[PDB]
Design a protein around this ligand. Structure first.
Ligand SMILES: CCCCCCCCCCCCCCCCCC(=O)OC[C@H](CO[C@@H]1O[C@H](CO[C@H]2O[C@H](CO)[C@H](O)[C@H](O)[C@H]2O)[C@H](O)[C@H](O)[C@H]1O)OC(=O)CCCCCCCCCCCCCCCCC
Ligand code: CLA
Ligand code: CLA
Ligand code: CLA
Ligand SMILES: CC(C)=CCC/C(C)=C/CC/C(C)=C/CC/C(C)=C/CC/C(C)=C/CC/C(C)=C/CC/C(C)=C/CC/C(C)=C/CC/C(C)=C/CC1=CC(=O)C(C)=C(C)C1=O
Ligand SMILES: CC(C)=CCC/C(C)=C/CC/C(C)=C/CC/C(C)=C/CC/C(C)=C/CC/C(C)=C/CC/C(C)=C/CC/C(C)=C/CC/C(C)=C/CC1=CC(=O)C(C)=C(C)C1=O
Ligand SMILES: CCCCCCCCCCCCCCCCCC(=O)OC[C@H](CO[C@@H]1O[C@H](CO)[C@H](O)[C@H](O)[C@H]1O)OC(=O)CCCCCCCCCCCCCCCCC
Ligand SMILES: CCCCCCCCCCCCCCCCCC(=O)OC[C@H](CO[C@@H]1O[C@H](CO)[C@H](O)[C@H](O)[C@H]1O)OC(=O)CCCCCCCCCCCCCCCCC
Ligand SMILES: CCCCCCCCCCCCCCCC(=O)OC[C@H](CO[C@@H]1O[C@H](CS(=O)(=O)O)[C@@H](O)[C@H](O)[C@H]1O)OC(=O)CCCCCCCCCCCCCCC
Ligand SMILES: CCCCCCCCCCCCCCCC(=O)OC[C@H](COP(=O)(O)OC[C@@H](O)CO)OC(=O)CCCCCCCCCCCCCCC
Ligand SMILES: CCCCCCCCCCCCO[C@@H]1O[C@H](CO)[C@@H](O[C@H]2O[C@H](CO)[C@@H](O)[C@H](O)[C@H]2O)[C@H](O)[C@H]1O
Ligand SMILES: CCCCCCCS[C@@H]1O[C@H](CO)[C@@H](O)[C@H](O)[C@H]1O
Ligand SMILES: [Ca+2]
Ligand SMILES: [Cl-]
Lengths: 97, 34, 35, 30, 49, 243, 97, 137, 101, 334, 202, 34
């Protein structure tokens, strides 16, 4: 069906331990980096291109626009100790919405 | 695109060093007495 | 574009006909037990 | 150079698929 | 533990609740772009795999 | 008589009406009567773009392009006053209508050239002494070509003129001077020129049809780059009426 | 130096009052009596060389003229800005709530 | 904080007369506003025309003034544009167009007062959220 | 004010402002620091002192909002312009430098 | 026999290295077409006007993407649900601008993957197997149909299909959250339970079997050599594993029946993922997550925010920014 | 049973699309507007409003360069603009009076829109079939107030769920019926295991 | 020094590829039944 198959039951069951255990451990390491804001936030080459070329657009640039909306719209209520006041005029919004 | 100039060599060695480690170990296993 | 469309129409018809006639060719019998 | 690298890794993986299927260690009963 | 310890306070740890955890996901997207992170991607591969 | 459901999805909705070969008539103008164009339609059949060569001394040519935005290019339902001037020339003053279409065409090699194909604020005049509009009447005039994107349009990094960021926010500590042209959006407004050459007249119905040629600039992406020169050719139809 | 013409306009009287030559029509809701009837006429008949010219619109009722007179002090005129008047933007400038 | 008689005390007319609404009337006003009006005016905005909201300051500058029970009750019988210049019953629910807006058919005078009382009370509770739109959600 | 002290009061030196794949020295990002420009004091047309709201470490990007000494908003840099009330143009915002270059 | 008969015999042969079969007669060409078009577009396709507003988005490697940002971009919003094959275009250049490759790929892929599922039934029957592995695969397949076909149908456009790309996928997720509040939808919550629980039971089963392997090797050899392909004897002690797990929790919380255990292993993720798929497929018709925005109100009528309202604020950020030049009117209705 | 399960699955899917798109045998007077209908009704609503305010809706260029109110379909027909461009195949009684052989007619638009069309378009825009599982009507970010989920959403979603699980039951039962007819539905005979009689793949 | 940006990858692969070829061959010679 698939081109390959298990032939060793012992290997099969060890692999079933391996895969989700390893995946959770990898996610933990990324979160340790996020503890420091050490993010994979950007691709610098994408930003340099998009800053100079206003016709260059990718799904990566589209998603940062969404992030910027999330930060501005959610921060004042989500981070009350900051006492954010964001006058309507500064909130990022596209057309109409 | 203005990429990191070390991207290429980092990527190349990332592939080559452990792939060659594995190939060395595979071939000398095959060459062991049948 | 006209030639391409006619080509694809022919190709698809050809394969659909294999699927239909194929499954018509005594399919239940093609198993390892009772035929 | 980056496009070349990405397509090169991809091509190695498709080649690997080919050897892993058609030049696998054949399963032998017992 | 580690995540809030790296941040300013426990306030930024996840709160223990269903909607509260949803909020934690969306915060990580808007502030950390956490979906872009290759350690999260490997997590997702090990969970779905 | 054709209904929407006869027409829908055929491409005919993007076609201007045509006149019969018998339509070689003459439409009298009474200099005491006021008139309008009740419907002007312009269907482009070729878009040409002037190449930009590496040196002066050879004049660049207009070269053919490939349309990539489908049958969405015609101007139609345009109307306005048709003035009789005191030398017997007529002047059309465009009032309203579907008087623009964004269009993207592609040069050989793939460079995409968006433009606002348009006759906005068109003022076009004939030769003097047009006692009748005939197959020898021509209109020549000028129109405005506003920015292809209007002032709210936001680029892929969120920058804009009447909305948007005013800087490259992903490069918080980059020097701003080298990015001024991309950061500070500008709204162009330039002039275009058009000629209409009457080829057919039905003297009895007020209808004319012919060929046109316009010249205008393409999109400059809110000031980010230099626009190209475009030459559009097609057929037109107009219905003239007393008003 | 390249300049954002909308920002520059915010430094003129357009930034202070209803600019009969430029301001989007919803701005006439700020004062009693202006919208929609007079707002439509005022935008339809723009531009005006001075604020008083607004009284020269044809067909006005006497009550309509008095409402204008009462509101001239809330009006200004500045040069027409192409970026504010194209795209039908005086009638709908893509801003809702 | 409580829904007190003071919060429930609103302008009855243009002349400065007030009326104190009961809690039953407050409940009834919310219920009936949801019933007949909220499909377009949820939260004090207007979905089909966002330039006009139900804020008290906006109502005060309408013609005739709509920032009181009388002005709101009259709006619900014979709605006009914001300048008082056209009658818009044909496109806005009212008692006079209950034939084409059937939900108006069984609204009594008492019901109109309750709905008008909701419009004046809600911003005293919600402040800028009333008529604010999504920014204030 | 020693330049060294001023330099510690700058987010470019905050270690929670990085990226996992933004490699190398801090100097590679904002550049090699040369000199303090001096302390910027912002004022509106009335001459009242205004304060720029600082970016918290969480935010890759942050709007420009100026408040008076009591935290009331007095000026900002709008996104949408058509309903702008607090632009630097409207409020006559100026900036004066004390100390530094 | 005749040519046809021998052909059928070959197509249905249990002896081919890769099973062909009648489903395979459709699957092979359709998967090959989708794969080839996908690889070529992902490398070399020019920018695609996904939202029909003449704002082309670059998906391919040669046009400035990397593996993470690259995508085959969905077809133009101007197209909607209209069928846009190559021959409907005036040129390949137009076809490319309008996102023709996306339709070609996804239609061939969906047909091919549905045939992959049929083929799984087919081979199981040729081999004298029980037939329901193909029912387990219906869960991922349903999910692919939800995001590439059902959702676009509900919303009236393939431009709202999931893009064929890593960042595109996240774009689809985030916009889906703004528009449907999926996190607050119980079918997506059941999907999370399905995939987190599938991971959990995968690790659990792997670890319980591995923990009770019968000693058959020395300390120098991998224990994997203690099992020989095709041996009759079970390779671990299930009574030992049950003995352990029944004590970890309590006796009746543990399976001692391997058939019941393996049924549970199949069922839990497959059912959860069917609900994931049905979550997307019913939010396709805008029956959306729970909305408790302003549900908690104090004695005066002040809104007392809950974590639901904080979600709402993040959703609003996504909503107001997404497709920033595509909306002219105040409601996003599809 | 299995053949019937497949057929009901298919019919379920068909019904889902019927209630979602069709407004003839599911009259919008009773079932609410379709998704395409409510989106078109919104554009109609603002065209009506802004043209009342004096906008020339035929010549109004939107931020993208496409007409803010009116644009062409890929075959040239005049259609509503903004996102609803996707819904230009929509047809309904309140809109058809405005449609001519070339699509939406600008002269009919400027002169012939009746108050009953404005009312219907406002009703349909504000009863779009979007709402939460607890029946809060509106987009997902809407505040509580309006208790609404369209009968169209309830009927489409329910029938898609049913049609899907009916496909699953079809596969379940069709594959079981095959196996039981051939005699191996209870498992493989340990002494007659077919794969042991077959040649190795390699 | 403004060196050619491919000089590093060229040198590394120049070294690595043939060296690895010899290491593979040597180790599988050693593992042969002696
Ligand atoms: C967690 C619990 C764990 C238990 C697990 C067991 C799983 C079974 C489900 C448990 C849920 C039980 C809650 C029952 C209460 C309920 O439902 O409460 C709701 C109602 C009764 O409550 C009323 O619910 C109404 C719902 O609105 C409806 O009525 C309104 C007012 O007329 C409007 O008309 C609105 O448009 C219309 O949708 C209103 O809110 C009323 O104010 C309120 O009194 O029960 C009803 O409706 C009856 C509903 C039965 C038929 C459901 C048909 C489903 C069709 C879609 C299926 C596919 C999609 C599924 C996605 C998931
Ligand atoms: C395809 C979709 C997808 C998938 C499969 C995943 C998968 C994963 N996500 Mg990602 N996520 C996604 C999309 C996805 N995510 C998107 C789009 C975002 C937006 C950015 C996120 C944002 C996100 C965040 C913010 C986090 C994840 C994390 C994770 C990991 C959670 C592992 C886990 O089980 O923790 C569950 C918790 C545990 C395993 C801890 C132990 C739990 C104990 C044993 C519970 C005991 C309970 C007790 C018995 C009884 C309970 C009582 C009862 C009443 C409840 C996992 C790798 C997390 C991660 O990376 O962590 C390192 C994390 O913090 N995700
Ligand atoms: C504790 C270890 C450590 C730390 C904290 C530092 C810290 C630093 N170094 Mg030093 N360095 C180290 C060890 C370290 N280095 C070693 C071992 C070497 C020899 C290779 C160097 C050689 C070195 C040079 C030549 C330079 C530095 C520089 C720097 C600075 C920038 C670091 C940077 O950009 O990282 C970037 C970090 C990353 C991009 C993260 C890498 C994450 C890996 C790739 C994850 C791999 C995942 C794995 C494959 C997954 C497997 C999954 C599987 C299990 C299933 C910083 C002060 C730079 C500097 O400014 O010099 C003055 C500089 O030029 N370092
Ligand atoms: C075609 C089926 C169908 C549809 C489209 C509707 C539609 C509707 N009903 Mg009706 N109804 C139905 C069947 C249906 N109902 C049945 C079977 C009953 C008997 C219980 C009722 C009794 C009923 C009453 C008493 C009421 C309604 C009401 C309503 C409205 C609100 C529904 C709501 O709030 O849901 C809430 C949503 C749920 C409760 C979630 C249901 C999700 C289920 C549990 C998941 C199904 C998954 C799958 C089938 C299981 C497979 C398992 C797998 C392993 C194989 C809505 C118009 C209300 C109304 O407004 O009346 C005017 C109302 O008061 N219904
Ligand atoms: C043109 C170009 C360049 C195109 C490429 C474009 C593009 C977008 C490419 C994609 C890039 C890509 C793949 C990105 C993913 C990167 C990523 C996140 C990788 C994860 C890396 C990583 C190490 C993660 C850590 C977690 C981890 C270890 C995950 C492993 C996941 C994994 C492989 C799981 C198993 C998957 C799988 C299909 C197993 C099949 C097993 C099998 C044959 C079962 C059948 C079976 C069952 C039985 O029960 C029995 C009894 C038998 C006998 C039997 O046989
Ligand atoms: C200081 C002081 C006071 C000290 C006193 C301490 C003291 C002595 C106390 C004694 C008193 C006492 C006991 C008090 C109790 C206190 C108390 C109530 C604590 C709370 C404990 C708590 C919250 C427990 C959490 C509940 C829990 C563990 C739930 C588990 C839920 C769950 C999903 C169970 C799994 C059930 C299930 C269907 C499993 C199948 C899935 C699975 C594992 C598949 C894999 C698998 C399974 C097999 O089955 C076998 C075979 C094999 C092969 C295999 O692959
Ligand atoms: C046998 C030898 C094998 C050869 C090594 C193989 C190399 C493979 C690639 C390694 C990855 C390198 C990634 C960096 C890319 C790059 O260009 O960096 C380049 C950076 C140097 O940074 C450079 O600096 C320059 C001025 O010095 C300029 O600023 C350049 O622009 C800048 O790129 O190199 C390093 O930072 C060195 C290593 C980083 C050490 C910090 C690591 C701490 C993280 C611990 C992670 C543990 C995770 C475990 C998970 C399981
Ligand atoms: C797996 C194996 C992978 C390679 C293993 C080791 C790689 C070593 C390769 C040595 C490359 C030479 C150094 C060049 C560095 C460089 O930048 O080149 C890079 C050059 C490309 O040149 C680049 O061009 C660019 C624009 O495209 C830019 O201008 C760059 O500045 C420029 O460097 O690559 C080549 O020219 C490759 C083909 C060379 C053809 C050589 C013909 C001569 C053949 C003589 C061979 C017989 C002699 C031996 C007999 C014994
Ligand atoms: C409130 C009022 C009540 C109304 C009721 C509501 C209706 C809904 C209830 C549905 C009834 C379900 C009965 C199914 C029994 C069954 O499966 O039999 C099959 C086997 C037989 O059990 C095995 O039974 C065997 C004996 S025999 O086969 O039954 O003869 C025995 O050998 C073995 O040890 C034993 O485990 O059951 C098992 O293998 C144990 C696991 C069963 C639970 C999982 C199956 C269901 C799907 C998983 C849940 C997904 C949800 C999570 C989503 C992420
Ligand atoms: C219709 C035909 C469809 C054909 C599709 C092509 C399928 C390719 C399948 C994988 C081939 C490569 C396997 C190498 C590895 C290989 O040869 O494995 C073979 C190995 C065989 O297992 P055994 O039990 O025989 O192992 C004995 C062990 O004891 C040896 O120590 O299979 C597994 O381990 C299964 C689990 C891994 C399954 C990996 C899944 C990979 C999915 C692909 C992921 C990446 C995609 C990247 C995209 C750019
Ligand atoms: C576009 C769809 C096309 C619509 C076609 C409508 C089909 C309805 C009429 C069916 C007539 C076909 O009739 C069917 O044909 C096939 C192919 O020749 C026959 O022939 C087959 O017989 C045996 C049966 O075990 C097979 O092993 C053998 O490979 C094959 O030759 C079937 O035994 C016969 O029953
Ligand atoms: C083997 C598959 C080949 C894929 C062909 C890519 C399209 S062809 C390609 O198009 C580019 C943009 O128009 C041109 O700049 C370039 O000159 C041309 O080579
Ligand atoms: Ca002529
Ligand atoms: Cl829109």
């Amino acid at each position: 069906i698939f081109g390959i198959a298990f032939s060793n039951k012992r290997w099969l069951h060890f692999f079933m331990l391996f895969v989700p255990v390893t995946g959770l451990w990898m996610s933990a390491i990324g979160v340790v980096g996020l503890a420091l804001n050490l993010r994979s936030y950007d691709f610098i080459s994408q930003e340099i291109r998009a800053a100079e070329d206003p016709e260059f657009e990718t799904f990566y640039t589209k998603n940062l626009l969404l992030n910027e909306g999330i930060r501005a719209w959610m921060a004042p209520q989500d981070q009350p100790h900051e006492n954010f006041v964001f006058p309507e005029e500064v909130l990022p919004r596209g057309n109409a919405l | 695109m203005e990429v990191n100039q070390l991207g290429l060599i980092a990527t190349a060695l990332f592939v080559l060093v452990p792939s060659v480690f594995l190939i060395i170990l595979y071939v000398q296993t095959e060459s062991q007495q049948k | 574009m006209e030639t391409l469309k006619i080509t694809v129409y022919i190709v698809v018809t050809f394969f659909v006909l294999l699927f239909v006639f194929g499954f018509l060719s005594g399919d239940p019998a093609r198993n390892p037990k009772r035929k | 150079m980056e496009t070349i690298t990405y397509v090169f890794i991809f091509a190695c993986i498709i080649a690997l698929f080919f050897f892993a299927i058609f030049f696998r260690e054949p399963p032998r009963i017992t | 533990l580690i995540y809030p310890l790296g941040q300013s306070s426990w306030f930024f740890a996840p709160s223990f609740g269903v909607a509260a955890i949803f909020r934690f996901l969306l915060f990580f997207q808007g502030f950390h772009n956490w979906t872009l992170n290759p350690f999260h991607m490997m997590g997702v591969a090990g969970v779905l795999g | 008589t054709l209904t929407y459901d006869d027409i829908v999805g055929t491409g005919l909705a993007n076609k201007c009406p045509t006149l019969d070969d018998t339509a070689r008539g003459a439409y009298p103008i009474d200099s005491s009567q006021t008139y309008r164009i009740a419907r002007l339609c312009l269907q482009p059949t070729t878009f040409l773009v002037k190449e930009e060569p590496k040196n002066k001394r050879q004049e660049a040519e207009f070269v053919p392009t490939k349309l990539v935005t489908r049958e969405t290019t015609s101007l139609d339902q345009i109307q306005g006053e048709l003035k009789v001037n005191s030398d017997g020339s007529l002047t059309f003053v465009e009032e309203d209508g579907i008087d623009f279409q964004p269009v993207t065409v592609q040069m050989a090699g793939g460079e995409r050239i968006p433009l606002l194909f348009t006759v906005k604020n068109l003022v076009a005049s004939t030769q003097p002494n047009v006692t009748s509009i005939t197959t020898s009447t021509d209109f020549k005039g000028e129109f405005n070509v506003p920015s292809y994107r209007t002032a709210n349009f936001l680029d892929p990094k969120g920058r804009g003129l009447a909305s948007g960021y005013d800087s490259a926010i992903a490069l918080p500590q980059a020097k701003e001077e080298e990015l001024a042209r991309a950061n500070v959006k500008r709204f162009s407004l330039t002039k275009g020129q058009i000629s209409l050459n009457v080829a057919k007249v039905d003297g009895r119905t007020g209808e004319i049809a012919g060929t046109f040629e316009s010249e205008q600039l393409s999109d400059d992406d809110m000031g980010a780059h230099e626009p190209h020169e475009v030459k559009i050719q097609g057929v037109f139809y107009a219905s003239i009426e007393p008003a | 130096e390249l300049v954002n013409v909308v920002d520059e306009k915010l430094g003129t009287a357009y930034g202070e009052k209803i600019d009969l030559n430029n301001t989007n029509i919803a701005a006439f809701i700020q004062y009693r009596g202006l919208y929609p009837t007079l707002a439509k006429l005022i935008v339809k008949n723009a531009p005006y060389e001075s604020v008083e010219d607004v009284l020269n619109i044809p067909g006005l009722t006497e009550r309509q003229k008095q409402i204008l007179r009462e509101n001239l002090e809330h009006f200004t005129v500045t040069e027409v800005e192409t970026a504010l008047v194209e795209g039908g933007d005086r009638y709908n400038n893509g801003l809702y709530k | 904080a409580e829904l007190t008689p003071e919060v429930l005390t609103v302008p009855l007319n243009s002349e400065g007369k007030t009326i104190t609404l009961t809690e039953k009337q407050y409940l009834e006003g919310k219920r009936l506003f949801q019933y007949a009006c909220a499909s377009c005016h949820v939260g004090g905005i207007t979905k089909t025309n966002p330039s006009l909201d139900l804020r008290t300051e906006t109502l005060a500058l309408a013609t005739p003034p709509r920032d009181n029970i009388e002005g709101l009750v009259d709006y619900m019988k014979n709605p006009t544009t914001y300048d008082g210049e056209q009658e818009i019953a044909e496109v806005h629910p009212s008692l006079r167009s209950a034939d084409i807006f059937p939900k108006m058919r069984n609204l009594t005078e008492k019901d109109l007062v309750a709905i008008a009382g909701h419009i004046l009370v809600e911003p005293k509770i919600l402040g800028d959220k009333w008529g604010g739109g999504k920014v204030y959600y | 004010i020693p330049e060294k002290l001023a330099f510690y009061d700058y987010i470019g030196n905050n270690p929670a402002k990085g990226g996992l794949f933004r490699t190398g020295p801090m100097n590679k990002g904002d550049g090699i620091a040369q000199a303090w420009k001096g302390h910027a004091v912002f004022r509106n047309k009335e001459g009242e002192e205004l304060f720029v709201r600082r970016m918290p470490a969480f935010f890759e990007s942050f709007p420009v909002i100026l408040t008076d000494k009591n935290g009331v908003v007095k000026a900002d840099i709008p996104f949408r312009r058509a309903e702008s009330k607090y632009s630097f143009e409207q409020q006559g915002v100026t900036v004066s430098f004390y100390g530094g270059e | 026999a005749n040519l046809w008969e021998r052909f059928c015999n070959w197509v249905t042969s249990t002896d081919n290295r890769l099973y062909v079969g009648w489903f395979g007669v459709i699957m092979i060409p359709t998967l090959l077409a989708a794969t080839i078009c996908f690889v070529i577009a992902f490398i070399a396709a020019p920018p695609v006007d996904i939202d029909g507003i003449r704002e082309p988005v670059s998906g391919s490697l040669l046009y400035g993407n990397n593996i993470i940002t690259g995508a085959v971009v969905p077809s133009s919003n101007a197209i909607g649900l209209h069928f846009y094959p190559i021959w409907e275009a005036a040129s390949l250049d137009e076809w490319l601008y309008n996102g023709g490759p996306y339709q070609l790929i996804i239609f061939h892929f969906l047909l091919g993957a549905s045939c992959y599922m049929g083929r799984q039934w087919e081979l199981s029957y040729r081999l004298g197997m029980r037939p329901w592995i193909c029912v387990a695969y219906s869960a991922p397949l349903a999910s692919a149909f939800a995001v590439f076909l059902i959702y676009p149908i509900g919303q009236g456009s393939f431009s709202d299909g999931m893009p064929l790309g890593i960042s595109g996928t996240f774009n689809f997720m985030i916009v889906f959250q703004a528009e449907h509040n999926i996190l607050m939808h119980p079918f997506h919550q059941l999907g999370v339970a399905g995939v987190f629980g599938g991971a959990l039971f995968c690790a659990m089963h792997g670890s319980l079997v591995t923990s009770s392997l019968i000693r058959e090797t020395t300390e120098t050899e991998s224990a994997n050599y203690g099992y020989k392909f095709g041996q009759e004897e079970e390779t671990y002690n299930i009574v030992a594993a049950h003995g352990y797990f029944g004590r970890l929790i309590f006796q009746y919380a543990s399976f001692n029946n391997s058939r019941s255990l393996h049924f549970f292993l199949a069922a839990w993720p497959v059912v959860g993922v069917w609900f994931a798929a049905l979550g997307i497929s019913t939010m396709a018709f805008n029956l959306n997550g729970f909305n408790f925005n302003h549900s908690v109100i104090d004695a005066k009528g002040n809104v007392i925010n809950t974590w639901a309202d904080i979600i709402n604020r993040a959703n609003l950020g996504m909503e107001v920014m997404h497709e920033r030049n595509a909306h002219n009117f105040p409601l996003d209705l599809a | 049973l299995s053949y019937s399960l497949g057929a009901l699955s298919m019919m379920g899917f068909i019904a889902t699309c019927f209630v979602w798109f069709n407004n003839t045998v599911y009259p919008s007077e009773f079932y609410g507007p379709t998704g395409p209908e409510a989106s078109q009704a919104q554009a109609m609503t603002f065209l009506i409003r802004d043209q009342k305010l004096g906008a020339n809706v035929g010549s109004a260029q939107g931020p993208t360069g496409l007409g803010k109110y009116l644009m062409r379909s890929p075959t040239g027909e005049i259609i509503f603009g903004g996102e609803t461009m996707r819904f230009w195949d929509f047809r309904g009684p309140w809109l058809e009076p405005l449609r001519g052989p070339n699509g939406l007619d600008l002269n009919k638009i400027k002169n012939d829109i009746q108050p009953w069309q404005e009312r219907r378009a406002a009703e349909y825009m504000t009863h779009a079939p979007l709402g939460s599982l607890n029946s809060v009507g509106g987009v997902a970010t809407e505040i509580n107030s309006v208790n609404f989920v369209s009968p169209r959403s309830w009927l489409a979603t329910s029938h898609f769920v049913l049609a899907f699980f009916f496909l699953v039951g079809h596969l379940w039962h069709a594959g079981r019926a095959r196996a039981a007819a051939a005699g191996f539905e209870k498992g493989i005979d340990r002494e007659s295991e077919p794969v042991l009689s077959m040649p190795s793949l390699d």
